[PDB]
């Protein structure tokens, strides 16, 4: 309802916000680590998860100070050892 | 303080009354066409007994004035040589030698048989392929008046024409150049 998360085949994550009155896609944040993202999942408003072609699952936390210069940090990175193609929390 | 400074007098206030072309015809004014203009402009000043010698003098004055304009313009684009001072006669080829050549120095000091002398003038200096200049555009005449400033001494005539010369300046931009390139790549 607030932003659009774009999963790039080369980049990790792209955060884009689309305005209603301006009607323009604005890119403000990115990620330093290049990842072959296959799928993505949403846990809550701030956390965005992503998969990998080889089995690398990571959760990216964005700082509260974002332009809703913004290189995304990583708090958890783990390799299963097998190819994971779906993430879902329930 | 500021009241002591004067203001320029407006020349527009003083004008003449009007109670009652030879520009689009591409003609020099002949004897008959100028007669109508003299009589209509002399009625305002109150002149009588229209003569004929004055019309001829005006026509020849215009002819000389236009010759001076063209002589001034060509002289800024072509070479010439001076005979006994200020006389310009050649207005032609490259008979003038290069002064940094010793062969030209002895030739300068010197001054069937006629053809060889022409070779000494037409072939002792220059380039293998002398390229001619483009035709006179609106730029060459504009610069010719700036340098000389002697052809037209009157300010009422020189001024009003020079801004019209400025407004007629034109040269192709980048966009038209591709069209020339496209056309040149089509005929080949």
């Amino acid at each position: 309802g607030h932003r659009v998360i774009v999963s790039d085949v080369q980049e990790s994550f792209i955060w884009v916000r689309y305005k209603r009155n301006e009607n323009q896609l604005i890119i403000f944040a990115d990620d330093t680590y290049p990842r072959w993202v296959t799928t993505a999942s949403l846990l809550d408003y701030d956390t965005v998860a992503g998969a990998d072609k080889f089995g690398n699952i990571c959760v990216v936390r964005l700082p509260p100070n974002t332009n809703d210069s913004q290189k995304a940090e990583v708090i958890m990175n783990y390799h299963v050892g097998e190819t994971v193609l779906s993430l879902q929390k329930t | 303080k500021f009241d002591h400074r004067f203001q320029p007098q407006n020349p527009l206030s003083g004008a003449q009354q009007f109670v009652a072309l030879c520009s689009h015809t591409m003609m020099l004014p002949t004897r008959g066409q100028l007669e109508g203009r003299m009589i209509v402009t002399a009625y305002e000043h109150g002149l009588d007994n229209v003569t004929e010698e004055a019309v001829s003098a005006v026509v020849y004055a215009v002819e000389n004035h236009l010759k001076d304009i063209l002589t001034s313009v060509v002289s800024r684009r072509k070479a010439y040589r001076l005979r006994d001072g200020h006389f310009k006669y050649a207005f032609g080829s490259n008979v003038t030698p290069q002064p940094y050549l010793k062969n030209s120095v002895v030739a300068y000091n010197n001054l069937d048989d006629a053809e060889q002398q022409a070779a000494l003038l037409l072939a002792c200096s220059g380039d293998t392929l002398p390229a001619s200049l483009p035709p006179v555009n609106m730029y060459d005449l504009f610069e010719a008046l700036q340098v000389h400033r002697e052809v037209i001494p009157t300010h009422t005539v020189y001024a009003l024409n020079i801004e019209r010369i400025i407004t007629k300046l034109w040269h192709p931009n980048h966009e038209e150049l591709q069209q020339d390139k496209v056309h040149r790549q089509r005929l080949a």
């Binding site: - | 000043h45 002149l47 304009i69 060509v74 006179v136 005539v157």
Partner: protein, 74 residues
């Protein structure tokens, strides 16, 4: 008809070309020259005895500012 603009160019330089927009400017130069001369001549005409005539003699006295001399009778 006769002597429009090209033959006067040949009268000075045999090989010289003029652009299409340059010809009209020269005619306007001549047009302004004609008006300036006749207006000054009429001013001198009204100066002789408040008006006398358009005189070729006083035109010679007028051409001193133009630095030209007519080869006419005078």
């Amino acid at each position: 008809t006769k002597k429009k603009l090209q033959d006067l160019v040949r009268e000075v330089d045999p090989n010289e070309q003029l652009d299409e927009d340059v010809e009209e400017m020269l005619l306007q130069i001549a047009d302004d020259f004609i008006e300036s001369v006749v207006t000054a001549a009429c001013q001198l005409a009204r100066h002789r005895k408040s008006s006398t005539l358009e005189v070729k003699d006083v035109q010679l006295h007028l051409e001193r500012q133009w630095n030209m001399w007519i080869p006419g009778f005078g």
